[PDB]
Design a protein around this ligand. Structure first.
Ligand SMILES: C[C@@H]1C[C@@H]([C@H](O)CC2CC(=O)NC(=O)C2)C(=O)[C@@H](C)C1
Ligand SMILES: [Zn+2]
Lengths: 292, 144, 159, 103
RNA sequence: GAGGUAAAGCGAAUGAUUAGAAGUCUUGGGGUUGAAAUGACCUUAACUUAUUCUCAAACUUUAAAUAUGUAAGAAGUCCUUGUUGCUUAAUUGAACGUGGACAAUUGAAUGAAGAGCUUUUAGUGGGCCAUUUUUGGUAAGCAGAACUGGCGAUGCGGGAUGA
RNA sequence: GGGUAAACGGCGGGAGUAACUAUGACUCUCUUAAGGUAGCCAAAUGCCUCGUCAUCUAAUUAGUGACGCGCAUGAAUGGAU
RNA sequence: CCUAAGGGGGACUCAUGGAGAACAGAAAUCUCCAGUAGAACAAAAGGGUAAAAGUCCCCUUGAUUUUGAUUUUCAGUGUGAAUACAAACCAUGAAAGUGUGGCCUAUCGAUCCUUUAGUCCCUCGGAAUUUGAGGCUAGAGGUGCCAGAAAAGUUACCACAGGGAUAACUGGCUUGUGGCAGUCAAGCGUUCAUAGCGACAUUGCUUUUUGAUUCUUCGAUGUCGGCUCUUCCUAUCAUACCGAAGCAGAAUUCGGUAAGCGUUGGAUUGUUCACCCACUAAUAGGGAACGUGAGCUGGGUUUAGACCGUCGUGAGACAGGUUAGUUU
RNA sequence: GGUUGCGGCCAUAUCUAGCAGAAAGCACCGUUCCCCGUUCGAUCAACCGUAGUUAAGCUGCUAAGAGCAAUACCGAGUAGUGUAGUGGGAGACCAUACGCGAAACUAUUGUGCUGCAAUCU
């Protein structure tokens, strides 16, 4: 009764969006605003702290843009944290803080800016920016890139932001998005931010649930139960993790049980292969012949 | 008009030698409705240079009445005689540009025997303009 | 009522290409322009700031100034019996590098590479480009290629 | 058009030289003085005989005047003048628009 | 490099448009079914599907020819390293340089009664015609444009005679 | 605010309606300062127009007598004799 | 036109269709699916725009200050508009960034004078003080004929300088319109396309209509009609000789060669034109500078007098009527 | 080679209908103390990675698939066009000479490639 819409004319004139826009992964408006560099700073690249949150992982990369494609400067993953003493809650706000601190220290060691720009040593929850040292190299400057993730006060991305800023990277920001910011009284509560930095919210949840709903405690905080980790000593886990990260931030790749060629050969087994033109011509001939 | 001025054809019945390349071929194509060109034989070149050969010496048209005149102006290009110049023209040599530019544009007379009935149409259609390819020699014999 | 506004007659010149509307690929914003570069001007309709006048659409010039988001291009325009240097400010979305440089810059390096070798080998080499010369003599063999005789065909109506 | 009663713009004052609060009000041209040299000159050229000695404009074409805003800085009392475009209607501090309401 | 005119296209968007065919009418009526069932049947009209004929100065995916921009070196390329309050995380750059190498094929053709620069002043500011492109008009030795060439300002040979 | 037109001057439209039709005494309607009265007229003033009828002639865009919604007649800008 | 319809940020996706839900139906609201923009973006049209430039929400005043550079129109002058920066000061955002009015292309204005703001500075010249005045920098008050005089008619009593750069005749180009002639053949014609006609179409000619144009003439080519007189054309009204018929005769109609020869007298009108009466073989049509004014006439038009109607406050107008008006 | 993150070119990558997917990753998935946001913890926020699943997303393959792209003894040296003639023709227009040269149509082929970092039976 109505005009069939998906006509050949509809397909012919359709302008497909950008590949990574149809994937729903890249916002090219924000990408244009971030990447584009002041033309009089000819080949000096802008550096993006790309922060991404999966269901199980945190990725924090430092990226500069080029025509052939983006080039990774340094990278830090949440699944690196077990090496530094954090095994559980790898997607906490505090795990995000640890990842940010790790990427900051790793990048600074790669550059050579370790003696200068050590960062906020005594994590207190105060808002503070990496201040340049007079008569010395300016701090590494990085701009946060949250992609399609929504900006809400208390979001985990700004945990990575805070960790990187405390690690010595100069990442410009305002403290009105940290958990602990009072909009009505426009100041940042340092104690609540400090609580969130050292897993205080997770510890409070364990305390509250343990003495109220113990079965949900057994199901949710199982890994802490088998680890004999109480609510009170969680803060020291993150405190030791911070010191360990600041002691040695270098990258240790995981030992791989197979070579690249072995992986390629193993994976190529489960891949269907395209037919020959002759094969599909034979298929068409067979179908016609069996149609009579 | 500009093309004809660059070929130094500034008067009627004026002749010049051109080395064929893509650039000069495209130049000549623009001037085709006004010129007759062809592939000259050796005897045609010799008769032209002997009877009507003049050199450009200090922007002056000087008759080639002695080999000293040719030498004084083309010795740095190893042209020591009228025969050297004719050979450089015929077998287009390394110094063709200098030798051909040294030659003043030849000033032929009207043909003895006339043209065809109507000139300003292509030689294929019974005119005289364009490329005639070996009949340039008969025309030059009429004209020199 | 004659109308001679700024963008008069740009109905097709300032249109986007078919199936090329929308956002600009970021290779445009990543290219680096230096003072003295040769660039082509092509107005992009989707960016109305820093847009050239319709005269400069399709003209080539020299970058002389580089600012935050723009370049200053120099164009020679015929005004009467002489040229006038025009200084146009263009956002880099309307500007592209001229490809005529690279082919010549390649020949500059290629010529030097060939020339220095000829000195090394104790010979000489001629570097000037040459127009396509008339072709030399050749022999056409006819094994399997006995000439086909073609004749004009009779007239025939084909409706 | 509608303009608010206040505005925070740049102040030219030597001790302000920054954005400060301003009280916006409309500009009214003052009355022509009788002792201005031009008036004082024109009143003698008109005396005696000769009639009307200067042009009197009649071919009016505009229907609107540019509205000038006289911005009073609240700190150093320095005035400023801002011209607007030509508008047939102009009020200061009117009712702000209500978007999404019925007729 | 740029272009959207000629051409082309319309079983490609917009708009215009000829003809049937097969379907849906369940959200068209008529007639005939029914003691009352909107549930059919014959019909025209609507739409839908695949086709079909013909178009567009102010339609278009495509898209010439001619005309048009730039480059084809010594004020160039390359190697090394000096200045800055600009720029970079930086010893990064950017701009301008010092010093060193690359000579007559110093980097396409052809031509050049030479190139460049300045002052000052005359007349003119009614134009017209031809080819080609083209608008209004039935048309015009009509009105108005585009490119070139002419007449005006020019005789001479031809068109008998004729800007 | 009053007076003054032998001061300058001005002096309207639309519908239906009478035991055929035609017309409209009549009615309704908008509107003016007032709505052209008595008279006169295709007049030296009427376009249409060589108006229609009669008379004058063999034949008359002429003449005269009538008729009259009169482009655009009319009362001391005097009307009719 | 807009304190948002400006600026920043965020979230969302539009027109429409389909399938469904009490009242509810073609149109209310709700839900899902499709939906490349077929919506919207103040106002013309064009361009542009989809995690937006569109819809909604939060915060705002960058629609701010200083003076330069550049683009368009261009003389590379002004005005308008726009662009990119510099030095400030701010808004917004986590931030990169963005913002010097409106997504872009239109939306506007010198000198003189006045006025306001700024600087509180310079001057009033014999020396001061205070009022007043005059300066310096930026706005506003306006010129739409928009590079910007302050401006009602009429001349039929007219003047001058000019103009064929320009109208009112002829002529010339054209032939729409006018006129005349073909081709085809659906029909008409008792049947019958074509004796005689001939629709719908289509091809021409003519310059006796009126146009269109403005080439010649404004240091003048005497511009209506009539009378008078000559000549020419043929597209032939009559007269000669013929062919055809829906030609029995008579009369008539169609056609050919034919311009030799003729084509009138009157009433009304200035008329050309027209319309009657009458005679006649017939009362055909045209040209010749719309033949013909040092041939006439002067009724008309179109000087100056005068009257009327309508129009105008008026002087006056009328391509309306009327009467009188030097023809070398 | 598979996968993830960030990309470059922006359909050879899109669209429709099917089928398959070991490891890992991604994902769907669970909960509401806390930060936060809603008519609604659906979206958004936080927490667990613990209870489950490859059903979907995602990836690959299939289709005389639509579309798109490329190529051509395809159409066609056609249409058109620059230049020329005291060429033809009443004209409208056309042919020829020296040059340049399409689009549709037809047919065939193809159906993302790739950079940086990490990870994996
Ligand atoms: C109409 C009014 C006056 C007008 C202006 O003063 C008229 C003057 C101009 C001039 O230079 N000389 C004169 O004699 C007349 C102006 O400027 C407007 C804004 C305001
Ligand atoms: Zn102040």
């Amino acid at each position: 009764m109505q005009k069939e819409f998906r006509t050949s004319a509809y397909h012919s004139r359709f302008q497909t969006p950008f590949r990574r826009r149809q994937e729903g992964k890249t916002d090219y408006y924000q990408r244009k605003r971030l990447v584009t560099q002041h033309k009089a700073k000819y080949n000096s690249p802008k550096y993006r702290l790309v922060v991404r949150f999966t269901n199980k992982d945190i990725i924090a990369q430092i990226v500069s843009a080029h025509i052939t494609g983006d080039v990774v400067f340094t990278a830090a993953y949440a699944h690196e944290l077990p090496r530094y003493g954090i095994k559980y809650g790898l997607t906490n706000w505090s795990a995000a803080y640890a990842v940010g601190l790790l990427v900051a220290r790793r990048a600074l060691q790669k550059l050579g800016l370790d003696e200068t720009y050590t960062g906020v040593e005594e994590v207190e929850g105060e808002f503070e920016l990496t201040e340049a040292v007079e008569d010395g190299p300016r701090p590494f400057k990085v701009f946060l890139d949250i992609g399609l993730q929504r900006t809400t006060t208390g979001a985990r991305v700004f945990g990575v932001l805070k960790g990187a800023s405390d690690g010595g990277l100069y990442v410009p920001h305002s403290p009105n998005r940290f958990p602990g910011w009072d909009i009505e009284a426009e100041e940042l509560d340092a104690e609540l931010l400090r609580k969130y930095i050292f897993g205080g919210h997770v510890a409070e949840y364990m305390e509250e649930l343990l003495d109220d709903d113990e079965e949900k405690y057994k199901s949710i905080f199982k890994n802490y139960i088998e680890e004999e980790i109480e609510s009170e000593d969680v803060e020291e886990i993150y405190a030791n993790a911070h010191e360990a990260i600041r002691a040695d931030p270098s990258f240790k790749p995981t030992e791989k049980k197979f070579t690249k060629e072995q992986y390629k050969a193993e994976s190529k087994k489960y891949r269907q292969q395209k037919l020959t033109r002759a094969e599909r011509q034979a298929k068409v001939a067979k179908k016609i012949a069996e149609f009579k | 008009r500009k093309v004809l001025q660059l070929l130094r054809l500034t008067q009627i019945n004026a002749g010049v030698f051109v080395r064929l390349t893509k650039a000069t071929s495209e130049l000549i194509k623009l001037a085709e409705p006004y010129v007759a060109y062809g592939y000259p034989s050796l005897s045609t070149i010799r008769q032209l240079v002997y009877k009507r050969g003049f050199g450009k010496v200090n922007k002056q048209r000087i008759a080639l009445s002695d080999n000293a005149i040719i030498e004084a102006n083309l010795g740095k290009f190893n042209i020591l005689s009228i025969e050297d110049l004719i050979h450089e023209i015929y077998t287009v040599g390394p110094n063709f540009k200098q030798v051909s530019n040294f030659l003043w544009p030849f000033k032929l007379s009207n043909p003895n025997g006339g043209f065809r009935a109507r000139k300003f149409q292509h030689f294929i259609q019974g005119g005289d303009t364009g490329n005639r390819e070996q009949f340039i020699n008969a025309l030059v014999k009429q004209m020199n | 009522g004659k109308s001679r506004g700024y963008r008069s007659g740009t109905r097709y010149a300032f249109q986007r290409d078919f199936k090329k509307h929308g956002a600009i690929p970021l290779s445009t914003y990543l290219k680096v322009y230096k003072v003295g570069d040769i660039v082509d001007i092509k107005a992009n309709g989707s960016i109305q700031k820093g847009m050239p006048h319709k005269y400069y659409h399709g003209k080539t010039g020299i970058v002389y100034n580089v600012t935050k988001s723009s370049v200053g291009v120099i164009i020679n325009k015929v005004v009467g019996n002489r040229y006038i240097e025009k200084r146009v400010n263009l956002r880099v979305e309307h500007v592209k590098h001229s490809a005529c440089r690279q082919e010549f810059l390649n020949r500059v390096k290629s010529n030097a590479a060939k020339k220095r070798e000829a000195k090394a080998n104790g010979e000489t080499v001629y570097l000037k480009r040459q127009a396509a010369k008339p072709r030399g003599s050749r022999i056409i063999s006819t094994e399997g290629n006995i000439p086909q005789t073609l004749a004009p065909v009779a007239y025939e109506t084909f409706i | 058009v509608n303009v608010p009663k206040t505005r925070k713009t740049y102040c030219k004052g030597k001790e302000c030289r920054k954005h400060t609060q301003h009280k916006v009000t409309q500009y009214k041209a003052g009355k022509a003085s009788l002792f201005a040299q031009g008036k004082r000159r024109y009143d003698r050229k008109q005396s005696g005989y000769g009639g009307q000695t200067k042009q009197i404009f009649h071919k009016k074409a505009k229907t609107t005047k540019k509205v000038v805003l006289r911005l009073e800085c609240v700190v150093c009392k320095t005035k400023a003048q801002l011209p607007l475009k030509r508008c047939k209607h102009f009020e200061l501090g009117g009712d702000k628009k209500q978007k999404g309401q019925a007729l």
